[PDB]
């Protein structure tokens, strides 16, 4: 799994984008907390639990609140460019 930022294109399906995000207040980061088996994110093979979402369709989400990121993803349309960077060490702060 590359640690460099990676460009991923997901096409929304009946189950949505096929992943969940976790975040907090601005600056805590936005991370993929779950990927649905057989959903669009899984079929791409490119996203991982523990990825930080750096941007969505050119919207910088590095310092976004959970709410800001959730609305960005909801309004990103039916094709979504995600810039992701694998950061399981930071993600784990959010996982019980």
From Swiss-Prot:
Subcellular location: Cell membrane; Postsynaptic density; Synapse; Cytoplasm
Biological role stated in the UniProt entry: Postsynaptic scaffolding protein that plays a critical role in synaptogenesis and synaptic plasticity by providing a platform for the postsynaptic clustering of crucial synaptic proteins. Interacts with the cytoplasmic tail of NMDA receptor subunits and shaker-type potassium channels. Required for synaptic plasticity associated with NMDA receptor signaling. Overexpression or depletion of DLG4 changes the ratio of excitatory to inhibitory synapses in hippocampal neurons. May reduce the amplitude of ASIC3 acid-evoked currents by retaining the channel intracellularly.
Family, per entry: Belongs to the MAGUK family.
Residues of the signal peptide: none
Domain notes for this protein: The PDZ domain 3 mediates interaction with ADR1B.
Subunit and interaction comment: Interacts through its PDZ domains with ANO2 and NETO1. Interacts through its first two PDZ domains with GRIN2A, GRIN2B, GRIN2C, GRIN2D. Interacts with ASIC3. Interacts with SEMA4C. Interacts with CXADR. Interacts with KCND2. Interacts with SYNGAP1. Interacts with LRRC4 and LRRC4B. Interacts with ERBB4. Interacts with KCNA1, KCNA2, KCNA3 and KCNA4. Interacts through its first PDZ domain with GRIK2, KCNA4 and CRIPT. Interacts through its second PDZ domain with the PDZ domain of NOS1 or the C-terminus of CAPON.
PTM characteristics: Palmitoylated. Palmitoylation is required for targeting to postsynaptic density, plasma membrane and synapses. Palmitoylation by ZDHHC2 occurs when the synaptic activity decreases and induces DLG4 synaptic clustering. Palmitoylation by ZDHHC15 regulates trafficking to the postsynaptic density and function in synaptogenesis. Palmitoylation may play a role in glutamate receptor GRIA1 synapse clustering. Depalmitoylated by ABHD17A and ABHD17B and to a lesser extent by ABHD17C, ABHD12, ABHD13, LYPLA1 and LYPLA2. Ubiquitinated by MDM2 in response to NMDA receptor activation, leading to proteasome-mediated degradation of DLG4 which is required for AMPA receptor endocytosis.
Part of the full-length chain shown: 307 to 402 of 724
Protein name: Disks large homolog 4
Tissue specificity annotation: Brain.
Highest classification ranks of the organism: Eukaryota, Metazoa, Chordata, Craniata, Vertebrata
Domain PDZ, first and last residues per copy: 7-87
Disease entry from the Swiss-Prot or TrEMBL record: Intellectual developmental disorder, autosomal dominant 62: An autosomal dominant form of intellectual disability, a disorder characterized by significantly below average general intellectual functioning associated with impairments in adaptive behavior and manifested during the developmental period. MRD62 is characterized by mild to moderately impaired intellectual development.
Domain of life, per lineage: Eukaryota
Gene name of the record: DLG4
